[PDB]
From a paper:
Ung inhibitors (which are interchangeably referred to herein as UngIns) are DNA mimetic proteins utilising charge-based alignment with the Ung DNA binding cleft to dock Ung. Docking promotes the hydrophobic sequestration of the sidechain of the apical residue in the Ung DNA minor groove binding loop, which is essentially irreversible under biological conditions, to inhibit Ung.
The sequences MCUGI1, MCUGI2, MBUGI, SYUGI, and JMUGI were biochemically validated to act as UngIns; the sequence MCUGI1 was also structurally validated to act as an UngIn by co-crystallisation with SAUNG. The structural conservation between SAUGI and MCUGI1 variants is observed to be close with RMSD = 1.005 Å at low levels of sequence identity (29%). SAUGI contains 17 acidic residues, while MCUGI1 has 18 acidic residues. Just five such positions of negative charge are common to both sequences, of which, three are located within a 10-residue span in the Ung-binding β-strand 1 and α-helix 2. Of eight residues comprising the Ung binding β-strand, 24ECESIEEI31 in SAUGI and 24LTEFVQLG31 in MCUGI1, only a single glutamic acid residue is common to these variants and five residues comprise non-conservative variation. The Ung-sequestering hydrophobic pocket of SAUGI is formed by six residues, of which, only three are identical in MCUGI1. The surface negative charge distribution of MCUGI1 is somewhat different to that in Ugi, Ugi-2, and SAUGI. However, common properties among all these four Ugi/SAUGI variants include an invariant glutamic acid residue, a conserved acidic motif, and a spatially conserved hydrophobic pocket.
Author numbering:
A (entry chain B): 2 to 15, 21 to 61, 66 to 117
B (entry chain A): 1 to 215
């Protein structure tokens, strides 16, 4: 609920939500420009997509029980607010979501 | 051949007693989905010699009034989850028909074995029942269908499904395979994949009646 609430409050202002869980090849996600982080290549990752039937979808990815992705979708267009490779954050916009890295090591 | 013979082989090849005793405690000391009676609803409604098509899901829906024993299906009254909304958009494009019911019981009747790879889950806990022996069970089910059926379509959505290609004798059987119909994946090529028509082209081609996907 910690990261879920924040990520949802934010996207609204720029109502409630349920959670769909799916395992995906890292590859299945829309990287677009970005090479897939080396330490993630060929990973099966747990994804939690938040939704309701007023509808745009937010989500969180994880791998070996560590948050690795946070993003939203709008058809073909995914954006990542957060990309981590297990070892280090490569991209962050958590400040938008009023979240720290330490809000992630602690949930 | 009947599921009960196949189930007998699998349950004698491996010792699911530890799993059975476990799920007994779970169902009497937890809220587990689906209903104990519906764990095999897929096998119930798609008898072994009626399998034309196999669609793998992963995990049963962990929410209330969702899971009833078929991959992707929620109870009639329930509301559409994402993967399933997208499955219907692609069906609308591929085949033409627009399904209103998020219940896939009629697909089961029509010969689509809607098999999740794990068949139980605790309410709210997303991967609660991984690694209790279900995956072994469902692996032997994909194997069994490959082994004792002659011409069957396997639709494999997302990488986890596609790890099951090594169970499927594609000398004997078809494999239609794409990224998962999750909104996160759907646009890296599930949309436009047209697996419903493809499945039927293949079935028509081995002199089998095609799947009616619609209501």
């Amino acid at each position: 609920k910690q990261i879920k609430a924040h990520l949802t409050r934010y996207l609204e202002e720029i109502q409630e939500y349920l959670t769909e869980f799916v395992q995906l090849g890292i590859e299945e996600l829309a990287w677009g420009e970005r090479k897939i982080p080396e330490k993630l290549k060929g990973a099966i990752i747990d994804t939690y997509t938040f939704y309701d039937h007023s509808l745009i979808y937010s989500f969180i990815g994880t791998y070996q029980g560590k948050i690795i992705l946070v993003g939203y979708t709008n058809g073909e267009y995914e954006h990542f607010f957060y990309i981590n490779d297990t070892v280090k954050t490569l991209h962050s916009e958590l400040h938008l979501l009023n979240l720290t890295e330490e809000d992630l090591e602690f949930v | 051949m009947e599921w009960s013979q196949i189930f007998h082989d699998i349950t004698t090849k491996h010792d699911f007693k530890a799993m059975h005793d476990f799920l007994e405690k779970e169902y009497s000391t937890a809220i587990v989905y689906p209903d104990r009676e519906n764990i095999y609803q897929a096998f119930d409604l798609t008898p072994f010699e009626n399998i034309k098509v196999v669609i793998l899901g992963q995990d049963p829906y962990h929410g209330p009034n969702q899971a009833h024993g078929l991959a992707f299906s929620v109870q009639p009254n329930a509301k559409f989850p994402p993967s399933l909304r997208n499955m219907y958009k692609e069906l609308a494009d591929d085949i033409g028909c627009v399904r209103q019911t998020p219940h896939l019981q009629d697909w089961a009747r029509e010969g689509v074995l809607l098999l999740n790879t794990v068949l139980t889950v605790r309410q709210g806990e997303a991967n609660s029942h991984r690694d209790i022996g279900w995956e072994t069970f469902t692996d032997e089910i994909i194997k069994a269908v490959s082994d004792y059926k002659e011409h069957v379509v396997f639709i494999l959505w997302g990488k986890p499904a596609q790890q099951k290609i090594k169970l499927i004798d594609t000398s004997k059987h078809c494999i239609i395979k794409s990224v998962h119909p999750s909104p996160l994946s759907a646009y890296r090529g599930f949309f436009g994949s047209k697996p419903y028509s493809k499945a039927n082209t293949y079935l028509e081609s081995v002199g089998k009646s095609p799947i009616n996907w619609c209501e």
